[PDB]
Amino acid sequence: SMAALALWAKSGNPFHPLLAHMLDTAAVALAVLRMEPPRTRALYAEDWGLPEEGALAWAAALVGLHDLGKASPVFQAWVAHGVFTELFLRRLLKEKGLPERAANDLAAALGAHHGFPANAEEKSRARRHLRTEDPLWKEARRWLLEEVFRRLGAPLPPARPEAVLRVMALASFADWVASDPSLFPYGRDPRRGDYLKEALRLAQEALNRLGWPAFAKAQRREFGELFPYI
Ligand code: NI
What we know:
Oligomer: monomer
Number of domains: 1
Order of helices and strands: HHHHHHHHHHEE
Bound molecules: nickel (II) ion
Protein name: CRISPR-associated endonuclease/helicase Cas3
Shape: globular
Number of strands: 2
CATH architecture: Orthogonal Bundle
Strand order of the largest sheet: 1-2
Helix content: 55-70%
Distance between the termini: 43 Å
Family: In the N-terminal section; belongs to the CRISPR-associated nuclease Cas3-HD family.
Largest sheet: 2 strands, antiparallel
Structural class: mainly alpha
């Protein structure tokens, strides 16, 4: 069962499913995109040719998939998981309908090297693992991508370098917030219907905390969007 394999994959702790972390990360992404200035949100709308609401759901879903590379026997019970994320997303985002070049660029944005694409050796090593993994893993990773897109209500756009870099920076921030168990406690069950609502509440509380005077001291401006500088 691919669904069982997908749900069994872990992130960061045995009681924290990968899917839970992916949805947490998406929730952070969506919550912070809602708080960004109108100029920032308008850029996303223009990046993807979507009404603002759809553009933001799409970006949030993409950012949630930053750890899809962990859905591999290599990271469950050397090459960084982001290299796998890039290889997997290159294929999977094309299967979802994104044109080749946009898919390749986004995959690198969500990969191991803060938007710079994995080199030949890294991709050789990774493919070496992929050749010997149980085939069900390939199916489990398609399942997970579809699960996140469906939970976020993300549409496919009908890609400029700045659009891709905006997603890169967002994923880096959101992954960091969601990765903190003091903000996003382990043990929440992502099968539950109410999971995303609860993750959005946690996202809102976390972003509030991160902004307090003893944490945030200035702002980071990257590619037309803004993050607290911690
Ligand atoms: Ni992560």
